[PDB]
Amino acid sequence: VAGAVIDGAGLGFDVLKTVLEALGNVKRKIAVGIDNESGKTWTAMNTYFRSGTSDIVLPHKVAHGKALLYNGQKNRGPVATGVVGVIAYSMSDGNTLAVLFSVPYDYNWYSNWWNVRVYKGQKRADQRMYEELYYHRSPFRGDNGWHSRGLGYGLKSRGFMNSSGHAILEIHVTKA
Amino acid sequence: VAGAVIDGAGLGFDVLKTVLEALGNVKRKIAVGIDNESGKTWTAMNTYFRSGTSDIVLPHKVAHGKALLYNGQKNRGPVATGVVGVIAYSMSDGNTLAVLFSVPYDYNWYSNWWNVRVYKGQKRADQRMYEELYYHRSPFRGDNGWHSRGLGYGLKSRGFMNSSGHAILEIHVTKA
Amino acid sequence: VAGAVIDGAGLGFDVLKTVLEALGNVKRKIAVGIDNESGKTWTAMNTYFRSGTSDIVLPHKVAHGKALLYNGQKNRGPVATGVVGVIAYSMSDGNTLAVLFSVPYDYNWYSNWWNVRVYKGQKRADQRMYEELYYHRSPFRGDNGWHSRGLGYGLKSRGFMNSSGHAILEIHVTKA
Amino acid sequence: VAGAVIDGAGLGFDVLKTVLEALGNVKRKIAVGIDNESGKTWTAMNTYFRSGTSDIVLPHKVAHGKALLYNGQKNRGPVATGVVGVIAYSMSDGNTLAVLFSVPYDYNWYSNWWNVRVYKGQKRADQRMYEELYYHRSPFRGDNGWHSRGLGYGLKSRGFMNSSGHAILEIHVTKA
Amino acid sequence: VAGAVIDGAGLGFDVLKTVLEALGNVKRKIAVGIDNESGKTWTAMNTYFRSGTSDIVLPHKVAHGKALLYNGQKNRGPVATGVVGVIAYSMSDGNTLAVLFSVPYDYNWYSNWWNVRVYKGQKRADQRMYEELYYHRSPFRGDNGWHSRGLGYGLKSRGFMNSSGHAILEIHVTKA
Amino acid sequence: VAGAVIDGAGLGFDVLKTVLEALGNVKRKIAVGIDNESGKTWTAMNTYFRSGTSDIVLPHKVAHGKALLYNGQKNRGPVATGVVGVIAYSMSDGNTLAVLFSVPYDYNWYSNWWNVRVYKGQKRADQRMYEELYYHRSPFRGDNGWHSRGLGYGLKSRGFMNSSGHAILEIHVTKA
Amino acid sequence: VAGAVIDGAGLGFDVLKTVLEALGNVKRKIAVGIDNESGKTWTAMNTYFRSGTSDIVLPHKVAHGKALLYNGQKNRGPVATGVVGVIAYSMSDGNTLAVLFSVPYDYNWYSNWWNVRVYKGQKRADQRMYEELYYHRSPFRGDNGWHSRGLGYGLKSRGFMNSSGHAILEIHVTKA
Amino acid sequence: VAGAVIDGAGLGFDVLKTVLEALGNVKRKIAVGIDNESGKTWTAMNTYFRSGTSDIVLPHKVAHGKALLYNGQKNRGPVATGVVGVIAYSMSDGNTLAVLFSVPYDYNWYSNWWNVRVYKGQKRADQRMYEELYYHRSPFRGDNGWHSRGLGYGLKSRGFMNSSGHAILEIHVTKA
């Protein structure tokens, strides 16, 4: 009897929502804290999200001896996407401090990654800047380790990123 | 037997409310903060909502060196509408400061957008003003970036809007 | 078998209460704040509710330079009624300050409205005073806009009312 | 099969308790505040409840320039009764201040009402005193309005009562 | 099929516990506060509960100008009994102050009652003392009224008891 | 069909746990407070529980002019046992202060009881000491009354115990 | 029909988890507090758990006139094991203070026990030391009694352990 | 009838999620606290997790006389993995302080373990360093005992680790 079709639909429907409420609860997020000990003032340009979003303003100014705090997180709902993108600040020397972060949904296939680079001139973050920092500029793993690196322009980085979905990226930018 | 119609209705009813309680939980909202460093006093006229509503008063006065805070949100219930509209303030020079915001329900088809314009004279916001600022005056994306722009009348804007359903729009209006 | 009648009744009963608990949760309410800068003292008369009720006392006195706060809300339970009515204050010049508010249940068919008028003499609010202010005296929409209006008797109004079910009506009464 | 009788009973039983838990949640109550500016001391006699009860002591003394606070509420459980009765205070001039309140269960058939009277001598409240103040002495409606009235004995009343099930009755008793 | 007996038992069992959890929630209790302004010191003897119990110690001493606080409540569980009994204090003049309270379960058949008497000598409370004070010594109703009464021995009472299941009994004992 | 055995088991199982969760919630406990005004120091020996247990240490010392606080409660789980036993303290005169308490599970068949005795020498509490104090030494009822009694050895008791399952036993031991 | 096998499995599965969630909730734990008034400093070696575990560090030092606090508890999950073991501290005289505790799961078959011994030299606790203190060295019962005992080496113990699953063991070690 | 397949699936599905929510609740974690009394400054390199992750930054600096606090935990979700890995700090003498921890999921097959070693030069932790410290360098058990060990380079360790899934590892590093 078609009585069994109605229950099939019922079970089928309870499966569906269990699965959607599950994927809904997977959280991927990133706290970013960058310490400006560069000797110059940074002014915010933008954050290009390749994946996910943010709920806050990107701090506009950041003086010598101050820290910038920003964060983001994957899109709400049962999507299987993470939080991935690039933060671009212009510096008072005319150049751009850029910072990559990647906190993926599917840890089977992907890992956490980060990067820091100083591009020449004012460059807003975008799909190209992300592709460069992610695929072609020796990005660091979110491997629970500290990594130092010279940036040019009389500057060096030193940064840490943990390996979980509740990611934090701490970076210090000092005079090399 | 019509026994299976009664269960079909039952399942059909539980589907319905699951879907309505879902759409009921989608939140779209906007916090707006505008900093008046324009040298003149602004007096509120109104907010035209193309979509959604607000639960608070639109601050009547805003002096030099003060900030205006307003907000809104989509209509209550299981509608698939967002929060979209224009805020109009009259300025003590005889002109209108207008500000667009768009925070749509369906991010598949739409994005966050904002705009700032200075119209000549007292102009209340309405469907026409919205259509202009949205479709025909190079509105900025809610792209997690800062965007500067001269307004005429010895004034410039500089504003930020994030990309999510929990939108904020921060704008500073300064003497160009 | 009459087994299906028992379930029909069951489903039919669960429909009913879902719908009644829903209509039960729809809230319509109004916060009213009127600022007396009229130069005279107001003394309360009454509030005629065309729809809904209040849970508090209508403030008896309101001096020069003070504000009156009152509120109301629709009737409890699964009724489809709103909150609608008129507040009447006598003023020390012998006349009545009257104030309309309308926050309807069914926004398909209706909108928020308000009005402010100065009637000559002591006039308690009632169905007639409401019908006048609502249908025949150019009432303002709850349209998220400020609206000024001279009242006669050396007085002007300037008021705001938002467009939602969680309505507020802010009105300032100053010496014209 | 008598299987359908067992479910009929089941549904029938779930109907019953839904209805009883509903009527159980209807609250009818009254907060009473009377301000003694009569020049004399009041001493409490009693409160005759025609309907409902109270959970507190009726304040025994109330001097010149002090206020009395009392309250009550309908009977607990799924009864369809309200809170209705008369409060009697003896006054130091030898007479009784009496105060009626009525907050009914079924607002289809009834409204809120109140009254204030000064009876000669010591008179405890009771069914007769209630019937007088309710049916035969021009009681005021709980109509969200202020109502003044001379009491004799060099005294006047001025009182307010809202229209809802969460009733309050505020009364001031001053020298006439 | 005996399948319907198993469901009959099931329904029958859910009826039972609904009813037992209901009767379990009926609370009957009594707070007692007696003010000793008798000029003598009272020393506690005991409380005879005709119905119900207490969870606290009966205060042993109570000086001139102090108050005694005690309370009780009906027996835990789905019994249909109330809280009813007599409190006996010996007084420093050699006599006993006795106090009745009755807060019944079934308000259809019974009411709240109280009494105060001064017996000659040391008399512990018991079934006889209760029967006297309840049936044969003009006990006062828990009628939301104050009642004064001379006690002999240069003493008078003046006491109040409300009419609900959440009873309080306030009594003042002063020098007549 | 054995289908009805599976449901019989099911119902039978839901009966069982309802009954076990009920008996699990019955609490029987005792707070004990003994005031040492005996002129000597008491040192704890032990508590023999005939029924139930404790979760705390039996205070080791108790000087002149100090009070001892101990408590216990029935065994965890759906047992139908109470909390019943004897507390033995050695006193600095070479003798034992012993104290009985009984707070039974089944108030149909049993009541609360207590006792105080002074035994000669060091005697730990045990089944015999309990049997003596319970069955053969005129123990006091937990009857919501104070009871005085000479103990010998220049000492008297005066103690109170309420009648409920949430028992407290307050005893004062003073120089006769 | 195999329909009854599916329900048999269902019931069978609900039995299983009810029983596993039950055994999961049985808690067995032990708080240990030992007061060092031995004249020497103790240094921790280890705790051998015959059954269960701990979640904290075993305090390393414990001076003259200080107390050591440690605790443990049975293993998480639906096991039927308790918390049982031996604590070994080295003392500044070259010897070991050892302390047994046993808080079993199944009180049908077992009781609480404790012991205190001073072994010559540094001896870590282990299965042998436990077997000695438990089976062969006259261990004290967790019987809600104080028990004194000379330890040799110019030292005596005096300890208490209650009889419940929420065990505490208080021991004082003083100069004999 | 295929009705029994639909229920089989249903039961089968409820089994599955009960089991997944269970494994989801098993927590394995580690708090690590290391006290630097080595006379030199440590600088963090990294933490290699063989199993699990962390949610925090590995403290970068740790001076003489200060303590480092870090922690981690197994991966979120119904995996049967623990938290296992090695922490590597460079020391101001040019060498690496390394610290192993192992807190496994399946206590049937595995135990808690820890280790401390001083490697020559800067060596980041990794799979090899873990395999050495775990399999080949006499690691200590998480056995609720203190264990001392000379490290070379004028340094010794002394550390404690408990035996449970809520592991802590406390280690002191002092001058040898």
Ligand SMILES: CCCCC/C=C/[C@@H](O)[C@H](COP(=O)(O)OCC[N+](C)(C)C)NC(=O)CCCCC
């Ligand atoms: C069928 C299983 C294969 C999973 C392929 C995963 C592709 C991901 O790179 C992106 C999302 O990558 P995500 O933003 O989370 O992580 C960042 C990875 N990138 C560094 C490459 C951007 N996945 C999706 O957009 C959803 C695919 C739906 C079918 C399972």
Ligand SMILES: CCCCC/C=C/[C@@H](O)[C@H](COP(=O)(O)OCC[N+](C)(C)C)NC(=O)CCCCC
């Ligand atoms: C079942 C577990 C096996 C894990 C296999 C790992 C594959 C990964 O090497 C890369 C992911 O590399 P990822 O982008 O995290 O890192 C590359 C490093 N850079 C970013 C520096 C280039 N996977 C892909 O590129 C496509 C996977 C989805 C298609 C089925």
Ligand SMILES: CCCCC/C=C/[C@@H](O)[C@H](COP(=O)(O)OCC[N+](C)(C)C)NC(=O)CCCCC
């Ligand atoms: C069915 C898939 C296509 C969705 C078409 C989207 C229409 C929206 O513009 C408006 C609401 O506009 P919203 O508040 O999202 O965004 C503002 C739209 N603008 C950006 C153009 C102003 N949605 C509706 O009126 C309900 C549509 C039900 C159709 C099945």
Ligand SMILES: CCCCC/C=C/[C@@H](O)[C@H](COP(=O)(O)OCC[N+](C)(C)C)NC(=O)CCCCC
């Ligand atoms: C097809 C039914 C649409 C609802 C029609 C509403 C008419 C309203 O005037 C009043 C409610 O008036 P409300 O409180 O919304 O606001 C007053 C509106 N006016 C100021 C214009 C009178 N409705 C009722 O009294 C019962 C409606 C029964 C529908 C199940």
Ligand SMILES: CCCCC/C=C/[C@@H](O)[C@H](COP(=O)(O)OCC[N+](C)(C)C)NC(=O)CCCCC
């Ligand atoms: C289908 C969407 C309609 C768009 C909203 C327009 C509403 C108006 O046409 C009036 C609303 O007139 P209202 O009383 O708000 O007056 C508008 C202007 N005044 C307040 C000044 C009179 N509607 C009704 O009276 C219908 C209610 C009968 C339901 C079967």
Ligand SMILES: CCCCC/C=C/[C@@H](O)[C@H](COP(=O)(O)OCC[N+](C)(C)C)NC(=O)CCCCC
């Ligand atoms: C179908 C007509 C039923 C309503 C008739 C109302 C009678 C009321 O006077 C009193 C309740 O009076 P209440 O305490 O609310 O208010 C006092 C009413 N008076 C002002 C007349 C005294 N009713 C009852 O005690 C049981 C009626 C069961 C109705 C569902």
Ligand SMILES: CCCCC/C=C/[C@@H](O)[C@H](COP(=O)(O)OCC[N+](C)(C)C)NC(=O)CCCCC
């Ligand atoms: C469906 C809406 C129509 C309401 C019609 C109102 C009837 C009421 O005037 C009186 C209410 O009289 P009430 O005593 O509140 O008002 C008179 C005011 N005084 C008490 C001051 C004289 N009802 C009754 O007397 C009997 C009601 C039971 C019928 C089954």
Ligand SMILES: CCCCC/C=C/[C@@H](O)[C@H](COP(=O)(O)OCC[N+](C)(C)C)NC(=O)CCCCC
């Ligand atoms: C069948 C309905 C008749 C109710 C008869 C009530 C008798 C009560 O006095 C006593 C309890 O009286 P209570 O202690 O609550 O109130 C005090 C009443 N006295 C002043 C007489 C002690 N009831 C019981 O012990 C339970 C009877 C079970 C059959 C329904």
Ligand SMILES: CCCCC/C=C/[C@@H](O)[C@H](COP(=O)(O)OCC[N+](C)(C)C)NC(=O)CCCCC
């Ligand atoms: C359905 C509502 C009708 C109420 C009928 C009231 C009866 C009461 O007068 C007395 C209760 O009188 P009570 O003891 O509260 O007060 C008498 C006053 N003194 C205590 C001063 C004697 N009932 C009884 O004595 C036995 C009732 C149970 C047998 C079926």
Ligand SMILES: CCCCC/C=C/[C@@H](O)[C@H](COP(=O)(O)OCC[N+](C)(C)C)NC(=O)CCCCC
């Ligand atoms: C079945 C109805 C008769 C209840 C007989 C009571 C026995 C109690 O003395 C003891 C427990 O004694 P308890 O802690 O209540 O009270 C102390 C008893 N004394 C006052 C004699 C010490 N109960 C049990 O051992 C479980 C009985 C299961 C029989 C179906």
Ligand SMILES: CCCCC/C=C/[C@@H](O)[C@H](COP(=O)(O)OCC[N+](C)(C)C)NC(=O)CCCCC
């Ligand atoms: C008929 C089964 C009764 C339970 C027998 C218990 C034996 C105990 O030695 C240990 C637990 O010892 P425990 O942790 O209670 O305390 C140690 C007791 N001794 C100190 C004597 C070893 N039990 C187990 O290891 C598994 C019992 C499986 C029952 C489903």
Ligand SMILES: CCCCC/C=C/[C@@H](O)[C@H](COP(=O)(O)OCC[N+](C)(C)C)NC(=O)CCCCC
């Ligand atoms: C029937 C035998 C199954 C248990 C074999 C255990 C393998 C473990 O080394 C690792 C887990 O190692 P874990 O993170 O707990 O601890 C590290 C273990 N080592 C110390 C050897 C590295 N297992 C897995 O990753 C998936 C096994 C699914 C078993 C239900």
Ligand SMILES: CCCCC/C=C/[C@@H](O)[C@H](COP(=O)(O)OCC[N+](C)(C)C)NC(=O)CCCCC
């Ligand atoms: C049912 C209880 C019996 C437990 C028997 C213990 C086996 C363990 O010695 C080792 C655990 O070796 P583990 O690496 O913890 O200990 C050696 C210690 N070191 C790592 C320091 C060398 N197990 C394995 O190597 C494979 C387990 C998977 C079999 C299906």
